């Protein structure tokens, strides 16, 4: 097993992690000076969100130069220092790779758009409109049509995401070669990993025919069905990742779960592991903003299916939070004062005992919660603006209805400044933060929790150590004890004759758990919200509200 199967990752959204110069935006020197903190927590590797030159219409995901560092984060020297300081700590760096699209301010697009006949025309998708409208009926994730007309040439360009995020043309060999050289630029600097943003949408459908009514309903899935997708991913592995020791992780958004093995089966020489969307969006509607009621049964059944697509040769990541989703404890736990800490601990136990490489999203180790928006403009984000364009301006929904749902689902919930201490703006900045800090920072902050052995932080820290010292908890088999149970999440992890039992009550009421026949408790490794460990030999557990536990069984 390669190092990454037993690693615990931490995701840093540098823009909201640590500001060191008072401009209100997190930067590299902030991250670097917090490495001791991350090492102390027990982190093996960090994935950072995009760190490249960008106009920031999508906070890093609209890249205007792949070979320069974003001005807000620092200089190339700062990046070099970050890597050096990670390596001194024995820690690895995974960077975000955004090559489905570039900023419209990238010099390639500026050149491409300039005329119909120039050497950069085919680095993007340019097409005549049809019948006085767009080339076809493709919608954008960020509002309106995915085609944007350019008065310079009178043709439309393709953008699945923002209008200022034109899609790169993977059908053009010279463009593919540019991407590979660019990736070598960073890999030559020693980065240890790459995460590929929307890796499944690289291939476009020949001829751009209209989406059928059915496909229009789930266009996200349709955009992942490009017929040259795996050809391209395989070429990239051959031309790039074969020549380095870096680990690769694809964000496979939109793709049906049964296709995931095509990305991660090691024999296929594409990616090493998968970020899948099934679990994190298990309670999201197809419109991507409405919530849908779900139970623990739905939660655990999704995990089981996702675990199954890995098989002997594939590998999954596991995460309950990221920069594109609401806060873990609010989303999956219960963020009310009486249950925030208890449920946050419970989800920690889950995260660090799943099969796959766990990714901890910044702030979740403190039990940070969703933000208490009012209306606009606490919601300033290109995605929400698109929801407004598609659903409110069109009369399909009111602003209150949109805001009611996006209060619960907006990715802005996960982008509020990390809560370091109880000083002004939670010690995140000495100025005014680009996004308001959650007022609960006075209670939920790192300085308070690091000194408290009962804290969510301390629990995550203890779990990370337990996972590090217990091979079965990383690479062991996974078996769900009862996929139909909507109250208590219970499963085993097993390897080399050693079996561990994980038991997590998802209700705020007492519950019981009968171990499967033949199985008894041998040792209790850890528990949360439990006044006392079970007796050695127990065939049953009595669970306090939101109790979690890890036990070795006999």
Give me the residues that bind Ca ion (CB under 5 A), please.
19, 21, 23, 25, 27
For residue 429, the minimal CB distance to Ca ion (Å) is 7
CB nearer to Ca ion: pick between 21 and 495: 21
DSSP string computed for 32-94: HHTHHHHHHHT--EEEEPP-EE---TTTTSS-SEEEEE-TTT--HHHHHHHHHHHHHTT-EEE
For residue 446, the minimal CB distance to Ca ion (Å) is 18
For residue 25, the minimal CB distance to Ca ion (Å) is 5
For residue 19, the minimal CB distance to Ca ion (Å) is 4
CB nearer to Ca ion: pick between 56 and 192: 56
Q: Is 21 annotated as a binding residue?
A: yes
Q: Is 27 annotated as a binding residue?
A: yes
Counting every residue written for the chain, the total comes to 554
CB 349 within 8 A of CB 548: yes
DSSP string computed for 133-144: B-SS-PBPTTSS
For residue 480, the minimal CB distance to Ca ion (Å) is 44
CB nearer to Ca ion: pick between 22 and 439: 22
For residue 185, the minimal CB distance to Ca ion (Å) is 25
CB nearer to Ca ion: pick between 19 and 365: 19
What is the CA angle 235-128-254, rounded to 5?
45
Q: Is 304 annotated as a binding residue?
A: no
CB nearer to Ca ion: pick between 423 and 540: 423
For residue 15, the minimal CB distance to Ca ion (Å) is 9
For residue 20, the minimal CB distance to Ca ion (Å) is 6
Cis peptide before 547 (omega within 30 of 0): no
For residue 111, the minimal CB distance to Ca ion (Å) is 32
CB nearer to Ca ion: pick between 291 and 430: 430
* CB-based burial, 282-319: b 16+ in 10 Å, e otherwise: bbbeeeebbbeeeebebbbbbbebbbebbeeebbbbbb
Q: Look-up: residue for tokens 């091979």? A: 471
CB nearer to Ca ion: pick between 428 and 459: 428
Q: Which of 483, 504, 501 is nearest to 493 (CA)?
A: 501
Q: Is 23 annotated as a binding residue?
A: yes
Handedness of CA 67, 68, 70, 74 (dihedral sign): positive
For residue 363, the minimal CB distance to Ca ion (Å) is 18
CB nearer to Ca ion: pick between 69 and 403: 69
- Give the C-alpha separation, 9 to 7, whole Å: 6
What is the CA angle 364-366-372, rounded to 5?
75
CB nearer to Ca ion: pick between 19 and 104: 19
What does the block give as tokens for 553?
């069984």
CB 138 within 8 A of CB 147: yes
Q: What is the dihedral of CA 304, 306, 308, 313, to 10 degrees?
A: -150
Handedness of CA 122, 213, 250, 333 (dihedral sign): positive
What does the block give as tokens for 21?
């110069």
What does the block give as tokens for 541?
């557990």
What's the distance, CA 392 to chain centroid?
28
For residue 457, the minimal CB distance to Ca ion (Å) is 24
CB 131 within 8 A of CB 140: no
Distance between start and end Cα atoms, the chain: 26
- Give the C-alpha separation, 499 to 476, whole Å: 9
Q: Look-up: residue for tokens 């009310």? A: 336
Q: Which residue is nearest to Ca ion (CB)?
A: 27
- Give the C-alpha separation, 124 to 182, whole Å: 17
Q: Is 25 annotated as a binding residue?
A: yes
- Give the C-alpha separation, 19 to 340, whole Å: 27
CB nearer to Ca ion: pick between 24 and 356: 24
CB 50 within 8 A of CB 14: no
CB nearer to Ca ion: pick between 73 and 125: 73
- Give the C-alpha separation, 190 to 212, whole Å: 45
Q: Could you tell me which residues are annotated as the binding site for Ca(2+)?
A: 19, 21, 23, 25, 27
Which residues sit in the known binding site? 19, 21, 23, 25, 27
């Amino acid at each position: 097993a390669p190092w990454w199967k037993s690693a615990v990752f931490y995701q840093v959204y540098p823009r909201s992690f640590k500001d060191t110069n008072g401009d209100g935006i997190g930067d590299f020197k902030g991250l670097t000076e917090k490495l001791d903190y991350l090492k102390g927590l027990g982190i093996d590797a960090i994935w950072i969100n995009p760190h490249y030159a960008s106009p920031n219409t999508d906070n890093g995901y609209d890249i205007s130069d792949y070979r320069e560092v974003m001005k807000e984060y620092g200089t190339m020297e700062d990046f070099d220092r970050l890597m050096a300081e990670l390596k001194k700590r024995g820690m690895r760096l995974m960077v975000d790779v955004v090559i489905n699209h570039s900023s419209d301010q990238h010099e390639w697009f500026k050149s491409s758009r300039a005329s119909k006949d120039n050497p950069y025309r085919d680095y993007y998708f340019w097409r005549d409109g049809k019948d006085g409208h767009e080339p076809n009926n493709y919608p954008s994730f960020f509002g309106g049509s995915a085609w944007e007309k350019d008065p310079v040439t009178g043709q439309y360009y393709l953008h699945y995401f923002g209008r200022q995020q034109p899609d790169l043309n993977w059908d053009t060999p010279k463009l593919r070669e540019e991407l590979y050289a660019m990736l070598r630029f960073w890999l030559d600097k020693g980065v240890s990993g790459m995460r590929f943003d929307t890796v499944a949408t690289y291939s476009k459908t020949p001829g751009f025919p209209d989406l059928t009514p059915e496909q229009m309903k789930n266009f996200a899935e349709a955009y992942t069905q490009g017929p040259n997708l795996h050809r391209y991913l395989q070429e990239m592995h051959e031309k790039v990742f074969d020549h380095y020791d870096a680990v690769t992780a694809g964000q496979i958004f939109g793709a049906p779960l049964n296709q995931v093995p095509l990305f991660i089966d090691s024999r296929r020489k594409e990616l090493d592991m998968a970020f899948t969307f099934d679990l994190i969006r298990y309670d999201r509607a197809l419109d991507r903003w409405h919530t849908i009621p779900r139970t623990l049964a739905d939660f655990r059944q999704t995990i089981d299916k996702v675990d199954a697509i890995a098989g002997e040769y594939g590998w999954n990541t596991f995460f309950l939070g990221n920069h594109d989703n609401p806060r873990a404890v609010s989303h999956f736990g219960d963020d009310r004062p009486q249950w925030r800490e208890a449920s946050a601990k419970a989800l920690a136990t889950v995260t660090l005992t799943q099969r796959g490489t766990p990714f901890i999203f910044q702030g979740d180790e403190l039990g940070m919660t969703n933000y208490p928006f009012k209306t606009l403009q606490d919601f300033d984000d290109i995605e929400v603006k698109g929801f407004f364009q598609d659903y409110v301006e069109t009369g399909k929904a009111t602003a209150e209805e949109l805001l009611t749902n996006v209060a619960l689902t907006s990715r802005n919930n996960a982008r509020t400044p990390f809560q370091w201490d109880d000083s002004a703006n939670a010690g995140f900045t000495t100025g005014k933060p680009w996004l308001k800090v959650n007022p609960n920072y006075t209670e939920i902050n790192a300085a308070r929790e690091i000194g408290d052995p009962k804290s969510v932080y301390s629990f995550y820290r203890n779990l990370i150590s337990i996972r590090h010292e217990t091979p079965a908890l990383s690479t062991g088999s996974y078996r769900d004890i009862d996929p139909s149970n909507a109250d208590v999440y219970a499963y085993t992890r097993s390897q080399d004759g050693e079996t561990y039992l994980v038991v997590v009550n998802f209700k705020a009421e007492p519950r019981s758990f009968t171990l499967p026949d033949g199985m008894h408790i041998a040792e209790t490794l850890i528990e949360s919200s439990s006044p006392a460990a079970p007796a050695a030999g127990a065939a049953s557990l009595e669970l306090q509200p939101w109790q979690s536990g890890i036990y070795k069984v006999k």
